[PDB]
Amino acid sequence: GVFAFEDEHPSAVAQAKLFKALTKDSDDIIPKVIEQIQSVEIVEGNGGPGTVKKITASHGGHTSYVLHKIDAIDEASFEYNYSIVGGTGLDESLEKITFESKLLSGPDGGSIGKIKVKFHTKGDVLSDAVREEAKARGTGLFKAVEGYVLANPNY
Amino acid sequence: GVFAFEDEHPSAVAQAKLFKALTKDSDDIIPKVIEQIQSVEIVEGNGGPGTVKKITASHGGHTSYVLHKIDAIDEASFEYNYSIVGGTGLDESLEKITFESKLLSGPDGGSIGKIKVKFHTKGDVLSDAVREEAKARGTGLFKAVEGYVLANPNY
Secondary structure: OEEEEEEEEEEOOOHHHHHHHHHOOHHHHHHHHOOOEEEEEEEEOOOOOOOEEEEEEOOOOOOEEEEEEEEEEEOOOOEEEEEEEEOOOOOOOEEEEEEEEEEEEEHHHEEEEEEEEEEEEOOOOOOHHHHHHHHHHHHHHHHHHHHHHHHOOOO | OEEEEEEEEEEOOOHHHHHHHHHHHHHHHHHHHOOOEEEEEEEEOOOOOOOEEEEEEEOOOOEEEEEEEEEEEEOOOOEEEEEEEEOOOOOOOEEEEEEEEEEEEOHHHOEEEEEEEEEEEOOOOOOHHHHHHHHHHHHHHHHHHHHHHHHOOOO
């Protein structure tokens, strides 16, 4: 099945500024802000739709890793979608997880990031722990990037 | 005179975790998250009340620094107060600035950071540019530490 969940994250950061950090500069930000994440390397691609990246997090004894595919980037509507297509960080019960982000405008020139996470299960059931852990991990990357942009006016 | 402005900041971080971050680990966190803050040097003290710190920042080609004294740290009430007592970063119109921070219980086991900025002016007027810059700098330090804790549950 395909299980979809949605959250909204208001932010004081302007859409265009948050969108650029989310889509062009997140490879440099995420490793800086998240301790565990050691590196972000491009496996194939030029940064646009279709690019595959390997993100390595130090722990789980020595390591862990996940592979992300960028599915879509739409500057006009501030939509950014990516999938976790593999890696030890993708639970065995799942085919893939997709994150769809859209930055709506919020009060005071801020943003409201609508984040929908879709779980592509192998079967008919979705574990609660699997759902919760993946949502936290995806929300944490959004926050790492948004928090960085807040703390660094002009970067 | 003394001009006091207060703002509230909801957060999903629990009071005890955010309090620990703000008062024990901010010295390490702040220079990692905020690009222009070059360093945090303890001038005197061990980090507790009474400690004096020199925070050096760097813009365009321009360096500037400010001296912070930790005024109070009350763990039971989650109050953390510090003052900016001098430095090229403190405006000539001011004697000092005092940030009074208090973490209230928020919904979801999260918290509400109530931050009060007190400007101790040499005269009877406070410049708008001076008020906004200081208020932004101070909110930035709070948000930089909070963003870091959200991104790293277990640092």
